[PDB]
Design a protein around this ligand. Structure first.
Ligand SMILES: Nc1ncnc2c1ncn2[C@@H]1O[C@H](COP(=O)(O)OP(=O)(O)O)[C@@H](O)[C@H]1O
Lengths: 370, 715
């Protein structure tokens, strides 16, 4: 019997079978409901659309995300998304498949406990497990020593690992990710005449961000070059014609990652949190943590983020250490790839939380033991 | 009388009543005639004080008694009273001296290569086995064949003839003669047809092993089908698990499949001018890892034979250049070179010459091939995404691609042979002749030896369970109320740690997946999971002066010492689906044929286990008959056999395993008349109710008395 890997994420649900090379079902984690009246009798109105079916009827729906910052805040919506994933996208029966869920570190225990209870009660899975996204990213990167910068859509975090031992006192978690960059782009576009207020228009802004934004190597002289010429201007076409052109917003949007004081945050950039997480570890392993900076997640996909990260950390770290930024072209699915690798291992089939153990212990087993 | 109708074969099947009756009456003492071990003959006859030309004194619980002269030349060794290894060895040797090359051992039909022409097949005079059961006619392979035929027509079951495959010669003639007997009884001929297609399967599936010069590295299952009522129909061959990891890597003192050196022998300049290949085998990394030439076979005449066998088949001019070009492309794969990108970890090609030649042969685009090897695509959801590949991963992909191309071409060749041998009306049943490589105990064992020994463990468990069933039926028929644990599974199922999902192969696959794994981590995991917990897994007794082994398994044919150095590199088989998509659209028609048919986890061990399950499932739906050919000596001298060689073969064949099995029940089974007559010297219950011997060493039922091994040796 095969196992299911269901890397949740706050902006994209990636599911599939343990052993495959890639997730089979990738769809936006969204639950939309019709706002408007409805007058055509006999249309066959549905209560609410999930996944990318709510992305195609985006005009008349109000889109909601049941995962805000890595924490599930609407549990019936999460149940709807899980049911969709299991039956309409994967087309399986969860009673016959162990499921490997995934999660970010340093978030409430009630999250894992409710995950376990929901699974074992309303899906009757034979077994389950809740891993950490960073360890799976390391599995997928093909190494056992490195500090992974996993930045998704709800949370950015660093987890330094050496020879297979996690250093939990150095795990740093930061609460700006793709969604906050989308909001900052939506707010920074109004200074050019374009106004996006609806959640559908938020998805449009997300696509603009994914298609045109990039990270500037040196921000100030790049800003000056943008101000001098118009060679950084590019045109995008909204889905009604009505093209728009953006200039320096292209690199002002992702710069929020390295200068989080743009959106009124007090924290440090991602480069400085990476360097601090390295400098929180023992002095004998940071030489190898420096040369294995593994990037993963969607928000780490901006063109030129590896060069800028390397330049920053090299300006921070001493002048002898070899700073290497590992940026695979498929780093958007590293968490899922590593999860399938982990769920395929023979030595792991002893780590599942079997339904019998749940019946014996209660929902509090998921973190007390596993 | 009942034997004089075999003509000139009578002297080679059964000795006359005169010579037998005068050989069953030799004066031999009970307690002063035994066997003692040795070093060069490994076992000798002796009279503790013992003498056979030299004197030796050994412990008084290591001498085994010779069988009495009443069991001197018995043709069914399950009927001896003292079942031990020297007894069986010397019974074989004694029957081979006074020329009688065939002997039964319980269920097997042991054959000895005579190296001397004997009229034991000569005319229909010796083909007069038509109906004579196993219990009546002399011990011939014709008895096995004719009983398979009779069973096929009486029970309407498919049958199988599992024959020895590890032996050098004597096996091919045995298969030829079984097929010939089947053609003769139920009579461009089928035998000549199956022999015509042989040089191609040789050139593509035969490799020079260290303990051979022409070794079949696959399992050939020749099935000859029979009509509704028993008329011979067409025959198709079905090939099973192929050692495809040989196309890449060869141990020292070995070669890969012959076709490479045959083509490369520069006997036909047209090929070496069309393949864009030179004539020096040391130029290509896939063919020259071991040795490039042997003096036991010339390559030019084998190449002519292969080309003429291709011409005999329906092969057209393009479907031969296709095969030759594919082999040349597999040759050019091995010497492609990739380098780490400057300051990065991505692989990029340095030198496109071999890429140019391989892409021009396979009918592809060189730039597209390179881009697909370096930057494979993957389907994530509904979109596509590129992927990163280090130099090691690119080399793994090239190796896996070469192996897949070679095995698909081999299967296509087998399909075309099956096609040119296919002509008849619908047919019901068949007789399969399974030929597969046997157990292997070398001085240096590796992954391939582990795979072959796993296959043979499966086959021997099959035979042991079959004998369990037959013994159960023969005990129930005679009403002998005696039940015992299953012979087959409850004895060898413990040595199948290899397959159970925590054993050797499962751990090997897990180590293939895990990051930064090596040989030392694999050894550590093996020891952590198996050392001390299972009694079959053991740490070897490494002696200073022999090859270094890492673990030892207790097989059915002894204990084998394996060396795990390099298993992770050989067990990986990651297929690149982008290059497969390039293959499916190649300009060369044969490549498109091969790859006409909502991946990075492929391993050699998993595919081997799947093919083994398939083969065992095919076999289990049949009724098996076993044949065991034996090489008596290495210098081809007829009549005399070397005892260490024959004993090694007799351990690996499974004969001594079956003897150990039969030595646990009641092997000595005698009728009531013969025992009431010969041992009347003072019905049978009363006569046996007077001796002091015992009570449980015998069992009575329905005109048959049973004896444990060693009670008819006291009498
Ligand atoms: N090419 C790209 N350039 C910049 N950002 C991208 C790109 N592709 C995706 N993203 C961002 O990545 C986010 C999705 O990342 P993902 O790893 O799926 O996070 P999660 O797992 O939490 O859903 C989206 O919000 C999107 O804005």
């Amino acid at each position: 019997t095969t196992a299911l890997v269901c890397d949740n994420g706050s902006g994209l649900v990636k599911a599939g079978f343990a052993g495959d090379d890639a997730p089979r079902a990738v769809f936006p984690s969204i639950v939309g409901r019709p706002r408007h009246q409805g007058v055509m009798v006999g249309m066959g109105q549905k209560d609410s659309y999930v996944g990318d079916e709510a992305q195609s009827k985006r005009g008349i729906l109000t889109l909601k995300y049941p995962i805000e910052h890595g924490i599930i805040t609407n549990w019936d919506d999460m149940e709807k998304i899980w049911h969709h994933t299991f039956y309409n996208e994967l087309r399986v029966a969860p009673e016959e498949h162990p499921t490997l869920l995934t999660e970010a570190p340093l978030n409430p225990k009630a999250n894992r406990e409710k995950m376990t209870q929901i699974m074992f009660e309303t899906f009757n899975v034979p077994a389950m497990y809740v891993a950490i996204q960073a360890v799976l990213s390391l599995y997928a990167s093909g190494r056992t020593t490195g500090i992974v910068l996993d930045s998704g859509d709800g949370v950015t975090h660093n987890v330094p690992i050496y020879e297979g031992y996690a250093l939990p006192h150095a795990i740093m978690r930061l609460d700006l990710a793709g969604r906050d960059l989308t909001d900052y782009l939506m707010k920074i576009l109004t200074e050019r005449g374009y106004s996006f207020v609806t959640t559908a228009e938020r998805e449009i802004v997300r696509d603009i961000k994914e298609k045109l934004c990039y990270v500037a190597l040196d921000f100030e002289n790049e800003m000056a070059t943008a101000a001098s010429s118009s060679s950084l201007e590019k045109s995008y076409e909204l889905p009604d014609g009505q093209v728009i052109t953006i200039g320096n917003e292209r690199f002002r949007c992702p710069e929020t990652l390295f200068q989080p004081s743009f959106i009124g945050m007090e924290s440090a950039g991602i480069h400085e949190t990476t360097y601090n997480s390295i400098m929180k570890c023992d002095i004998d392993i940071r030489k190898d943590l420096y040369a294995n900076n593994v990037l993963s997640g969607g928000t780490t996909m901006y063109p030129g983020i590896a060069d800028r990260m390397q330049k920053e950390i090299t300006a921070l770290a001493p002048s002898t250490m070899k700073i290497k930024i590992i940026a695979p072209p498929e780093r958007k699915y590293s968490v899922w790839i590593g999860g399938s690798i982990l769920a395929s291992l023979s030595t792991f089939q002893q780590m599942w939380i079997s339904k019998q153990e749940y019946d014996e212990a209660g929902p509090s087993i998921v973190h007390r033991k596993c | 009388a009942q034997m004089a109708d075999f003509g000139a074969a009578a002297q080679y099947l059964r000795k006359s009543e005169k010579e037998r009756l005068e050989a069953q009456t030799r004066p031999f003492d009970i307690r002063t005639e035994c066997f003692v071990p040795d070093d060069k003959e490994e076992y000798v006859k002796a009279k503790a004080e013992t003498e056979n030309g030299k004197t030796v004194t050994i412990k008084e619980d290591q001498v085994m008694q010779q069988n009495p002269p009443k069991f001197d030349k018995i043709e069914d060794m399950a009927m001896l009273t003292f079942l031990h290894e020297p007894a069986v060895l010397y019974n074989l040797k004694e029957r081979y001296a006074a020329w009688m090359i065939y002997t039964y051992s319980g269920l097997f039909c042991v054959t000895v290569n005579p190296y001397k022409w004997l009229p034991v097949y000569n005319a229909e005079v010796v083909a007069a086995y038509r109906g004579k059961k196993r219990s009546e006619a002399p011990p011939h392979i014709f008895s096995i064949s004719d009983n398979a035929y009779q069973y096929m027509l009486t029970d309407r079951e498919n049958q199988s003839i599992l024959i020895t495959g590890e032996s050098g010669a004597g096996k091919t003639v045995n298969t030829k003669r079984v097929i010939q007997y089947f053609a003769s009884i139920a009579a461009g001929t089928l035998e000549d047809q199956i022999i015509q297609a042989n040089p191609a399967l040789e050139a593509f599936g035969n490799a020079k092993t260290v303990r051979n010069d022409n070794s079949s590295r696959f399992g050939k299952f020749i099935r000859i089908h029979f009509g509704a009522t028993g008329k011979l129909a067409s025959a198709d061959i079905e090939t099973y698990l192929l050692e495809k990891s040989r196309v890449i890597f060869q141990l020292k003192a070995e070669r890969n499949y012959h076709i490479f050196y045959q083509i490369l022998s520069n006997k036909k300049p047209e090929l070496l001018d069309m393949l864009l290949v030179t004539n020096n085998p040391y130029d290509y990394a896939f063919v020259s890892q071991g040795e490039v030439s042997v003096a036991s076979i010339d390559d030019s005449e084998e190449l002519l034979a292969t080309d003429s066998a291709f011409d005999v088949l329906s092969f057209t001019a393009e479907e031969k250049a296709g095969v030759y070009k594919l082999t040349g492309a597999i040759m050019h794969y091995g010497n492609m070179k990739f380098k780490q990108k400057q300051r990065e970890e991505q692989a990029e090609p340095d030198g496109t010459e071999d890429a140019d030649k391989s892409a021009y042969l396979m009918g592809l685009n060189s730039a597209d091939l390179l881009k697909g090897l370096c930057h494979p695509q993957v389907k994530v959801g509904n979109e596509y995404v590129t992927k990163g590949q280090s130099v090691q991963q690119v080399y793994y992909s090239i190796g896996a691609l070469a192996k897949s191309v070679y095995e698909k071409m081999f299967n296509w060749m087998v399909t075309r042979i099956n096609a040119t041998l296919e002509t008849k009306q619908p047919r019901q049943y068949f007789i399969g002749v399974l030929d597969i490589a046997g157990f292997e105990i070398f001085d240096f064992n590796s992954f391939e030896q582990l795979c072959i020994n796993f296959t043979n463990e499966k086959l021997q468990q099959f035979f042991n369970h079959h004998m369990f069933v037959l013994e159960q039926e023969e005990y129930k028929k005679e009403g002998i109320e005696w039940e015992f644990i299953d012979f087959g599974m409850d004895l060898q199922a413990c040595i199948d740690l290899i397959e159970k999902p925590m054993g050797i192969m499962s751990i090997l696959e897990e180590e293939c997946m895990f990051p930064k794994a090596s040989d030392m981590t694999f050894k550590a995991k093996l020891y952590d999971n198996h050392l001390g917990k299972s009694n079959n897994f053991q740490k070897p007794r490494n002696v200073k002066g022999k090859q270094e082994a890492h673990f030892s398994l207790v097989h059915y044919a002894g204990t084998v010492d394996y060396n795990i150095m390099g298993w992770l590199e050989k067990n990986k088989d990651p297929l690149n689906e982008t290059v497969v998509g390039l293959y499916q659209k190649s300009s060369l028609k044969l490549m498109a044929t091969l790859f006409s048919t909502k991946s990075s986890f492929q391993t050699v061990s998993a595919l081997h286990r799947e093919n083994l399950n398939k083969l065992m499932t095919n076999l289990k739906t049949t009724h098996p008959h076993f044949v065991r050919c034996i090489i008596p000596n290495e210098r081809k001298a007829p009549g005399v056999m070397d005892n260490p060689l024959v004993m090694h073969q007799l351990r690996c064949n499974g004969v001594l395993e079956g003897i150990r099995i039969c030595r646990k029940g009641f092997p000595n089974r005698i009728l009531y008349g013969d025992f009431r007559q010969r041992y009347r010297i003072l019905g049978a219950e009363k006569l046996l109710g007077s001796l002091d011997i015992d009570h449980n060493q015998y069992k009575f039922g329905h005109t048959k008395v049973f004896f444990k091994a060693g009670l008819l040796g006291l009498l």
